[PDB]
Amino acid sequence: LLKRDPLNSMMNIPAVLSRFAGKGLLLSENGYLRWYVASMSIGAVVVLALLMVL
């Protein structure tokens, strides 16, 4: 049962989550300028709403 070292795999879980999150975040860098402008507008909306609610 233990010859695979299950605790080592359990501690390798955060590395796998890091790869997954990085590959997901790299999808936002599609190279399109209009999407970059749209993301700046989205961030402006988020920042302004967060400042208004606090």
Binding site: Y32, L33, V37
Partner: protein, 100 residues
């Protein structure tokens, strides 16, 4: 007896209209036009704020704003010329080969 909020709201409306034009237009010339609308709306907001306080600083900031607008339009037109010369089209989605 014009309220300051009315002038600021008018400037905000023009700003978000220019930003929408910048986002929804694939032609680089219309994107430059939307950028001009954006900077002119911000300069109008500065003029409104300067007129509310009775200060020349609003029009001074307006002057600096349109100086930036002129130089930015100059550079944008040079880049649009290069895009047209090297692509024969002004589609901004075509210049997207850097990604990842």
């Amino acid at each position: 007896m014009i309220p300051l909020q009315h002038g600021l709201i008018l400037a905000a409306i023009l700003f978000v209209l220019g930003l929408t034009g910048l986002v929804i237009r694939r032609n680089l010339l219309f994107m430059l036009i939307g950028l001009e609308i954006m900077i002119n709306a911000s300069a109008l907001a500065f003029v409104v704020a300067g007129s509310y306080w009775g200060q020349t600083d609003g029009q001074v900031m307006y002057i600096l704003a349109i100086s930036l607008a002129a130089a930015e339009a100059s550079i944008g037109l040079a880049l649009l010329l290069q895009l047209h010369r090297r692509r024969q089209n002004l589609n901004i989605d075509s210049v997207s080969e850097m990604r990842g």
